[PDB]
Paper text:
Repair of Iron Center proteins (RIC) form a family of di-iron proteins that are widely spread in the microbial world. YtfE has an L-shaped two-domain architecture: it exhibits an N-terminal ScdA_N domain connected through a highly flexible penta-peptide to the C-terminal four-helix bundle hemerythrin-like domain containing the di-iron site. Altogether the data so far gathered for YtfE such as the induction by NO stress, the interaction of YtfE with Dps and proteins of the iron-sulfur biogenesis system, the iron donor properties of YtfE, and the ability of YtfE to promote the formation of an iron-sulfur center in IscU and ferredoxin, all indicate that YtfE is a bacterial iron donor.
Our previous studies indicated that mutation of E159 to leucine in YtfE affects the formation of the iron center. The E159L mutation induces instability in the overall structure as judged by the higher atomic displacement parameter values when compared to the wild type YtfE. Moreover, the iron is weakly bound as deduced from iron release kinetics data. Substitution of E159 by leucine caused the side chain of H129 to change its position towards the protein surface, thus impairing the coordination of the second iron atom. This might suggest that the movement of the H129 side chain is concomitant with the release of iron from the di-iron center through the hydrophilic channel. The presence of a di-manganese center improved the overall quality of the crystals with the diffraction data measured at 1.9 Å resolution. Still, in this structure, designated as YtfE-159LMn, coordination and ligand distances were maintained. Data showed that the wild type protein has a higher affinity to the two metals than the YtfE-E159L mutant. When compared to the wild type, the iron release rate of YtfE-E159L is approximately 7-fold higher and that of YtfE-E125L is ca. 8-fold lower.
Author numbering: 2 to 220
C-alpha cells in the first residue's frame, strides 16, 4: 500500500505526485522520509482517497527517474534547472511583492510582509546554493561523498529553515490564493510564487531524498 511508502519515494516515482502532495500541504521534500500514512494522519486526511489518486497517477512511469541517475548528472541538473532559476525568480518576485504591498496597501487581503520573507529566502538560499556549488557538490563529484556527513547535515538544516520560510509565505498569501479584487500583477506574482514553491520543493526533495543519501552511501 502506498501509505506505507515514504513521501519522497512516492514523489520521485509517480509523475505529478509532487503536485498532489502540494495540494495536501504534505512536506515530501524536507520531510520526505515520513510515510504517507503518518503524514496523512497528522493532517486528518482520508488516506484511501490519496492512495486512489496516486494509483491513477502511477498508470504512467515518471518521465525522468533520478533515483538511480549518476550523482554528477543530478548535480548538473540541479544547478541549471533549480539554482539558476531561483536566482532569476526570486529577485523578480521581490520586486513584484514590493509593488503589490505598496499599491494595495489599503486593501485588507494585501500580503503584508511578503517582500520581507521573500528577501530572507533569497539571502539564505543564495548563500546556501553557493556553498553547495563551491564546496559540497565538488566534494561529491570527487568521490568523497561518504565523508560528507557534516556538510550534508548543515545543508539539510538550511533546507528546514527554507521550509519554515515557505510556510510563512504561504500563510501570508492565504496559501498563495489571491482575493477576488486581485489585479493582474497580484495574480501573476502568486503564480510565480507557486512556481517557486513547486520548484524549491522538488529541488530540496532531489537533494534530501536522492543526492545526499546516495552520496553518503558511497555512490
Ligand atoms: Cl507533512
Ligand atoms: Mn541546491
Ligand atoms: Mn540545498
Ligand atoms: O538548495
Amino acid at each position: 500500500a502506498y501509505r506505507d511508502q515514504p513521501l519522497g519515494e512516492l514523489a520521485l516515482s509517480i509523475p505529478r505526485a509532487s503536485a498532489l502532495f502540494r495540494k495536501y500541504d504534505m512536506d515530501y521534500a524536507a520531510g520526505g522520509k515520513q510515510t504517507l500514512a503518518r503524514a496523512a494522519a497528522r493532517k486528518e486526511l482520508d488516506v484511501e482517497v490519496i492512495e486512489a489518486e496516486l494509483a491513477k497517477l502511477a498508470e504512467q512511469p515518471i518521465e525522468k527517474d533520478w533515483r538511480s541517475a549518476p550523482l554528477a548528472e543530478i548535480i548538473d541538473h540541479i544547478i541549471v534547472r533549480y539554482h539558476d532559476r531561483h536566482r532569476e525568480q526570486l529577485p523578480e518576485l521581490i520586486l513584484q511583492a514590493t509593488k503589490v504591498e505598496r499599491v494595495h496597501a489599503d486593501k485588507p487581503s494585501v500580503p503584508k510582509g511578503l517582500t520581507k520573507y521573500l528577501t530572507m529566502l533569497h539571502e539564505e538560499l543564495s548563500s546556501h546554493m553557493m556553498k553547495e556549488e563551491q564546496i559540497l557538490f565538488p566534494m561529491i563529484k570527487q568521490g568523497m561523498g561518504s565523508q560528507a556527513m557534516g556538510p550534508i547535515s548543515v545543508m539539510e538544516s538550511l533546507h528546514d529553515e527554507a521550509g519554515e520560510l515557505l510556510e510563512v509565505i504561504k500563510h501570508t498569501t492565504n496559501n498563495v490564493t489571491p482575493p477576488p479584487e486581485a489585479c493582474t500583477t497580484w495574480k501573476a506574482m502568486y503564480n510565480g510564487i507557486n512556481e517557486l514553491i513547486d520548484d524549491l520543493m522538488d529541488h530540496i526533495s532531489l537533494e534530501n531524498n536522492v543526492l545526499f543519501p546516495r552520496a553518503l552511501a558511497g555512490e
